[PDB]
Design a protein around this ligand. Structure first.
Ligand SMILES: CC[C@@H](Nc1c(C#N)c(-c2ccc(-c3cccc(C)c3F)cc2)nc2cnccc12)C(=O)O
Ligand SMILES: CC[C@@H](Nc1c(C#N)c(-c2ccc(-c3cccc(C)c3F)cc2)nc2cnccc12)C(=O)O
Lengths: 312, 306
């Protein structure tokens, strides 16, 4: 069954605490609406086992969940069931790349600083009201839970976000895009380099989405980017993953959803290529890495939109 | 399920049992218990800030003693952990000790001396339950915990109800076979169900009518159980006897996998009755008449009344 075992005791506690958190919330009324106190709330749990479950789990740890009611509501508004979320993060250990990915590739887990946590509380009310008003249709990072772990006197804060990329379709090419930045020699020798602004230009990278999806996509991005500028946030990226249908076919032939198809209620950032693309590709594109508080944010926001618009 | 109660100690207990059993579903069923399992425990301390503030207290501790041992005893007593969790969780235990909402379990506040004395006997108790294959009139110890809330600390034990989860008891005796004054008070006797005692049993001319076979099997168990208690040098235990009157009314019947202490009366009983008989309240050590004597005086009496 589920033992939450890992060589990494921080992962064990994270799996245990997400399991704990979600079961706890199963015993707490879903409120008609969130209230101000829910934006300053937490749960702290300290465990001290003696000669009990000593092989699977560390015997001494702390787990703290920030604003559990808000992040439950955000999961709901982003179309996530708490049971599915719990399974995604606990049924098997998250895999490392620094970030981790849930075993089913739905979710990203990232270590963050206490400043980041303090800045999350600073934006949390405004972020939640924005998510309500766009009915959860945004390119913004979906913040799904936020925790503090302590084991063996090692303290970390972690955020969970939705994977920009597909849980199923492989990404053969990947870009972190800002505007106004090229991968190192070391980065480029990996299997999947995180390529950057100059790699995008100098490799002659094109993205082939039809006028309609381009308009829809640049309309969200403008709204999301203007919201980030009102918050006075900057140094955020567009993450672009490219799925090449034909490369994934030959990669697999060596060893019901058709090739180049995805479920848009799971792979929410997916966009099909247009009819006249030289190759059958699927693009996965959203905003990551939002949380730098004040170029100025106006300037950052306009340069970003201008660079993304000039590449489509 | 919100584990709501007017009594914050019941909420933590319900929360605690719910936590304890969910935890053990993430822990391997071992091939056998080992010595460290009789010294083990799990403590959880909870501190909430503006979260679940209405249903639950914001600050509490729950400790389970020897979790691996109590899970093994539940299984050896024919008790599934989910059904156990449900009996203690789906709805609050009712005060009279307390009874689970479905009347399957007793919940009782004990002292830290009681807790220390349970650890002292727990290895021998478990190995006794192994050797009698769960077939005993001893108390079934099903879990043992420590709760803190609002700086108030209690220890609690959970045992199986001697009485039925459905059939009513119209008459009830705490029997020891002590020669001394054992008589329920005038206050006790005015209650709807008084706990009657040895001299009430004799002075009321109470009869238990069970056939020669069930009496032999009952007295064989009681003897082995009571010789075990003497070996441990425990005393001051009682036979608890509940009598269900079938006539006040299928009527005569009960599931003997649920109500395990039930025994039907003799066919030639003048009154249709069902008897619920077992040992309670064993944890008094001699160190504090001796345990041999108590045990011998206790059996002579129970055999004297059947
Ligand atoms: C290109 C970066 C990296 N992969 C990813 C990262 C990372 N890293 C993040 C991510 C999550 C959280 C933070 C974060 C950092 C600080 C504070 C707070 C709140 C945060 F959310 C920052 C970045 N999201 C991803 C979504 N989909 C796919 C890949 C992702 C890679 O492939 O190299
Ligand atoms: C006749 C007394 C009372 N009812 C009961 C009690 C009580 N009290 C107990 C009980 C449980 C635990 C301890 C205990 C006490 C100290 C230490 C440790 C470990 C213990 F288990 C002592 C007694 N069991 C019952 C089982 N079935 C039915 C009724 C029961 C009543 O009706 O008035």
């Amino acid at each position: 069954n589920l033992y939450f075992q890992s060589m990494d005791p921080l992962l064990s506690v994270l799996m245990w605490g997400v399991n704990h958190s979600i079961n706890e919330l199963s015993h707490v009324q879903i409120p008609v609406m969130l209230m101000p106190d829910d934006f300053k709330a937490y749960s702290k749990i300290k465990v001290d086992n003696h000669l009990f479950n000593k092989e699977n789990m560390p015997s001494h740890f702390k787990f703290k969940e920030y604003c559990p009611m808000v992040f439950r509501n955000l999961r709901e508004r982003f179309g996530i069931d708490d049971q599915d979320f719990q399974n995604s993060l606990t049924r098997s250990a998250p895999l490392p790349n620094r970030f981790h990915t849930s075993y089913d590739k739905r979710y990203i887990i990232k270590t963050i600083t206490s400043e980041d946590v303090a800045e999350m509380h600073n934006i949390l009310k405004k972020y939640h009201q924005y998510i309500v008003e766009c009915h959860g249709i945004t390119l913004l990072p979906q913040f799904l839970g936020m925790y503090r772990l302590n084991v063996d006197g090692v303290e970390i804060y972690v955020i969970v976000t939705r994977n920009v990329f597909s849980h199923r379709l492989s990404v053969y090419r990947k870009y972190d895009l800002k505007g106004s930045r090229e991968a190192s020699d070391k980065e480029k020798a990996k299997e999947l380099p995180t390529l950057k602004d100059n790699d995008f230009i100098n490799e002659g990278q094109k993205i082939y989405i039809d006028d309609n999806n381009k308009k829809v996509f640049l309309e969200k991005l403008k709204k999301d980017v203007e919201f980030l500028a009102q918050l006075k946030l900057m140094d955020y990226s567009l993450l672009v993953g490219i799925h090449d249908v034909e490369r994934a076919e030959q990669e697999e032939v060596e060893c019901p959803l058709a090739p180049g198809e995805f479920d848009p209620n799971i792979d929410v950032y997916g966009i099909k290529c247009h009819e006249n693309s030289p190759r059958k590709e699927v693009y996965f594109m959203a905003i990551i890495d939002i949380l730098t508080h004040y170029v100025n944010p106006e300037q950052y926001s306009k340069r970003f939109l201008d660079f993304i618009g000039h590449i489509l």
